């Protein structure tokens, strides 16, 4: 809550930063900065103060053209800005220049120029560049970069920063230095630099139309260099995805990648130089498990994307981040969906916004993707900017088509191209598009904007009409959003919704699937030439961020989840079924407590939905990957968006019965299934390929490793052995699976004991391990988290670590949310003593206080005073002291 900036108010600086030219002397206990900055006077100036970002700089020199200016008199420095006095600043082109002192080896806040282990490295997104020098650290303020790196040439011997190298040399005393010119103006979040022991993979593209040569670099410490392989293949597919379907090029001879240890975020998009968290970046099939493989594609296809959206088109101001995430999101998924050609990719996705990103819209927290205001950029890195900006991206292309979005999307990056850039911009594009597509310039997308402006998560609801007789049906849709802070009076969003119409005799498409344009409040839709009552399959593919009421019967749902064509519609057709048992078991148990009943009924599980999973597990043709989605309840967070006061025990026990329910009827199917995927799912064809991933495979082993849990739970006869022989596996998805499902054992700790030692010489494995533990259903588990600090986590201040040891832990329902508090207070703990370092990593554990007003009313209370005990330590952060001021409803 210091300084609140506000989306109406931007206005162009008085100034303009026409080149940077750097030099940064690394030394062990020091690094020395030294900059020019040749500037002149904008024609929005009005003879202000020249005032500078720069946060905990320690100045030796400060000068204008050649004269040296004087603390007092000249100018002011408080620790966050520095002051130079109009009467001093010219008033035509001048040359600033600084030399300051800063501090990477006890950095460990990960932002500005720090130490990860041996490296040097910097982060400055969004405001970082302002920790390494003075700067208008602004996204607006594009510049053009001449970067000198100097080290000692024994600790550090590879020396990065953005663009070309244009000379290297030897300086007295063991140095060495590296210059770079980077000829693309850019705003300094996108400026980086490296040095250190650095090994590599390399390789050269060439360009699709223009036979551009590129040089293309992987890099990591020497231990781990073997496991760059499949990154530099995906930076390959991402190139060639650009050029495929947008008809984008690389723009520079020479792109790096490199990993580091310590990062808060995933991966960043520095100019030529993009620096990855190495469980981003780096696998080998040996020591990795399976979801490292489609990280790592999904990592290094997003920044690859940047380079585009978000470098050579960038950022007028923050509050516009979401047209560079939420529509680099969006070019990650096509990549990804194409990559993989999986119907699980896109569910996934789907998966996650319905669960993390509706809570965040429902909380106190909602904002609409392009924010009003902010206090600390950092918080505004969110699901709803990211994942909802991706479906408001994604809406474009399901609204145009293939060929009028590739239009749209061509006149973006032409008008653009080496400029910062707005979200109207965007929307100015597809509409261009839209009006060619619709053949009449009065068409207009101005009703679009309402996605980028109005906060909160749409509810689509559905009433049907058949005329036997005449042929005929109707659908009658309604949308709503619920007022909120952001806006009192919510208006009717461009919803489009794609449909097809199932025939339930024979489970045929009975139309086209079309795309209902849905623009008012409510409309009818009627459809003529329609033979018998359909089942409607209705947002295919997940085709608006709403929340979608189909208003079917089970019945009906089932006939979809057998049926239909499209995956979304029959895993939302199974998570609705699911959702109707849940709720109504949820009331059962809730009335039961209240109530201190002696004695009560729960409603089954439908018997025919067990018959259709049973139909669909049995299929051998039908999908290893969907067939898991329809044996797991739905999310935790997903759930919670659809009860108030939500008792957390209670959930607890109403999935338990609906999971025993089923189990009841389905295990011997599980455990046939179970073994008959075994040949298949661990067969080692590529397995020392890193160039090649079998996605298929990778879904049929994460099927056997659901099932397993499954047949564990239930303490399925002589189980265990099954258990034992997959803790053999070669796969580290298995073998780690077999830790997580012995749970349930007198065995946990022998697994605990044999996994640790396959996993602790590898420090993703490690923390993959560290992630199984804290994620394992035990009784004992605080016990067990005692054990890990105590053991394993220690000191460490690397964020995986500490973030693999807690955050699965708290998505542990029962224990958690003990009623006790217990698990409330042990992870404000952890926050509060993370916040001393790393604010960042700090606000990233509050993640699961965000449903605090969604729970009953003992656990709102409980957390509550957690974070109010939170907001009283001294010196707390303006990143965590801003996040919990807005959760708890003061800011
Ligand atoms: C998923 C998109 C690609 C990953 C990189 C992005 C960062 C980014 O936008 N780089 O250009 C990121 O870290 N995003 C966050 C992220 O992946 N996080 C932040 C903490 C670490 C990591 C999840 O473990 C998500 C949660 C928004
Ligand atoms: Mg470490
Ligand atoms: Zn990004």
């Given at each position: 809550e210091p300084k609140i900036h506000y989306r109406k108010d931007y206005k162009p600086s008085g100034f303009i930063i026409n080149n940077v030219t750097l030099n940064i002397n690394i030394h062990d206990n020091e690094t020395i900065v030294r900059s020019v900055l040749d500037m002149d006077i904008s024609?929005?100036?009005?003879?202000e103060d020249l005032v500078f970002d720069g946060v905990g700089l320690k100045i030796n020199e400060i000068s204008i053209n050649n004269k040296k200016l004087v603390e007092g008199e000249e100018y002011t420095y408080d620790n966050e800005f520095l002051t130079i006095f109009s009467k001093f600043v010219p008033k035509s082109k001048f040359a600033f220049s600084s030399e300051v002192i800063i501090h990477p080896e006890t950095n460990?806040?990960?932002?500005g120029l720090y130490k990860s282990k041996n490296i040097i490295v910097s982060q400055c997104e969004?405001?970082?560049f302002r920790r390494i020098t003075f700067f208008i650290?602004?996204?607006?303020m594009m510049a053009k970069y001449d970067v000198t790196v100097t080290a000692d040439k024994e600790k550090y011997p590879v020396l990065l920063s953005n663009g070309d190298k244009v000379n290297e040399f030897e300086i007295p005393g063991g140095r060495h230095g590296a210059r770079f010119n980077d000829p693309h103006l850019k705003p300094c979040y996108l400026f980086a630099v490296v040095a250190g022991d650095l090994k590599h993979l390399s390789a050269t593209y060439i360009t699709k139309y223009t036979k551009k040569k590129v040089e293309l670099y992987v890099f990591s410490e020497?231990?781990?260099?073997?496991?760059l392989q499949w990154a530099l293949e995906c930076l390959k597919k991402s190139m060639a995805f650009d050029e495929d379907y947008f008809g984008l090029e690389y723009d520079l001879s020479r792109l790096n990648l490199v990993a580091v240890?310590?990062?808060?975020?995933?991966?960043?998009?520095?100019?030529?130089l993009n620096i990855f968290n190495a469980n981003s970046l780096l696998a080998s099939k040996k020591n990795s498990i399976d979801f490292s493989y489609a990280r790592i594609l999904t990592v290094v296809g997003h920044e690859y994307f940047?380079?585009?959206?978000?470098?050579?088109?960038?950022?007028?101001?923050?509050?516009?981040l979401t047209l560079k995430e939420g529509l680099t999101v969006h070019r990650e998924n096509l990549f990804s969906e194409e990559m993989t050609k999986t119907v699980t990719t896109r569910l996934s996705h789907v998966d996650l916004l319905r669960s993390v990103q509706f809570l965040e819209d429902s909380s106190p927290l909602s904002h609409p993707i392009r924010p009003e205001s902010y206090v600390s950029?950092?918080?505004?890195?969110?699901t709803t900017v990211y994942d909802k900006g991706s479906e408001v991206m994604r809406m474009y292309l399901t609204i145009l088509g293939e060929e009028y979005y590739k239009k749209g999307f061509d006149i973006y990056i032409k008008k653009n191209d080496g400029n910062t850039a707005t979200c109207e911009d965007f929307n100015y594009a597809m509409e261009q598009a839209y009006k060619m597509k619709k053949a009449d310039?009065?068409?207009?997308?101005?009703?679009?904007l309402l996605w980028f402006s109005q906060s909160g998560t749409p509810h689509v609801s559905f009433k049907y009409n058949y005329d036997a007789e005449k042929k005929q049906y109707s659908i009658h849709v309604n949308q709503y959003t619920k007022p909120d802070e952001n806006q009192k009076e919510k208006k009717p969003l461009f919803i489009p919704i794609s449909v097809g119409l199932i025939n339930?005799?024979?489970?045929?498409?009975?139309?086209?699937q079309t795309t209902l344009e849905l623009t008012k409040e409510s409309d009818t839709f009627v459809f003529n030439n329609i033979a018998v009552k359909p089942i409607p399959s209705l947002?295919?593919?997940?085709?608006?961020?709403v929340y979608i009421e189909?208003?079917?019967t089970d019945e009906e749902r089932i006939l979809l989840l057998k049926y239909d064509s499209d995956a979304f519609v029959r895993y939302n057709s199974c998570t609705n079924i699911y959702m109707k048992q849940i709720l109504m078991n949820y009331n059962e148990f809730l009335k039961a407590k209240n109530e201190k009943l002696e004695s009560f009924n729960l409603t089954p599980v439908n018997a025919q939905f067990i018959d259709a999973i049973k139909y669909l597990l049995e299929?051998?043709?039908?999908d290893a990957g969907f067939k898991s989605y329809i044996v797991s309840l739905p999310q935790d967070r997903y759930i919670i968006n659809?009860?108030?006061?939500?008792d957390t025990d209670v959930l607890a026990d109403t999935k338990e019965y609906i999971y025993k329910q089923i189990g009841d009827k389905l295990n011997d199917v599980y455990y046939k299934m179970f073994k008959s995927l075994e040949a298949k799912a661990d067969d080692?064809?590529?397995?020392?390929?890193?160039?090649?991933?079998d996605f298929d495979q990778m879904n049929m082993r994460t099927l056997r490793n659901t099932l397993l849990s499954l047949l564990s739970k239930a303490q399925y006869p002589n189980i265990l052995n099954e258990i034992i022989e997959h803790?053999?596996?070669?796969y580290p998805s298995n073998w780690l699976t077999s830790l997580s499902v012995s749970?349930?054992?007198?065995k946990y700790f022998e697994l605990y004991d044999k996994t640790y030692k396959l996993s602790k010489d590898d420090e993703l494995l490690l923390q993959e391990w560290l992630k199984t533990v804290s994620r394992?259903?035990?009784?004992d588990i605080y016990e067990i988290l005692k054990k890990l600090e105590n053991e394993?986590?220690?000191?460490?201040?690397?964020p995986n670590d500490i973030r693999a040891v807690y955050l699965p832990f708290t998505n542990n329902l029962r224990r958690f949310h003990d009623i006790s508090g217990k698990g409330y207070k042990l992870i404000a703990e952890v926050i509060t003593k993370t916040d001393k370092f790393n604010p960042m990593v700090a606000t990233q554990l509050?993640?699961?206080?965000?449903?605090?007003?969604?729970?009953?009313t003992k656990r709102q209370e409980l957390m509550l005073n957690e974070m109010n005990t939170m907001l009283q330590?001294?010196?707390?952060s303006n990143n965590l002291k801003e996040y919990l001021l807005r959760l708890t409803n003061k800011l």
């Open positions: 024609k929005h100036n009005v003879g460990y806040a990960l932002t969004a405001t970082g650290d602004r996204p607006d020497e231990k781990y260099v073997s496991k240890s310590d990062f808060n975020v995933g991966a960043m998009e520095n100019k030529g940047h380079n585009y959206t978000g470098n050579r088109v960038t950022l007028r101001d923050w509050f516009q950029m950092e918080n505004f890195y969110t310039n009065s068409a207009n997308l101005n009703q679009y339930p005799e024979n489970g045929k498409e009975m139309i086209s947002f295919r593919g997940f085709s608006a961020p189909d208003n079917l299929d051998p043709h039908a659809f009860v108030s006061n939500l080692l064809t590529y397995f020392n390929d890193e160039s090649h991933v803790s053999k596996s070669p749970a349930y054992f007198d394992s259903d035990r009784k394993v986590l220690k000191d460490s201040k690397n509050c993640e699961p206080f965000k449903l605090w007003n969604k729970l009953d330590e001294p010196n707390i």
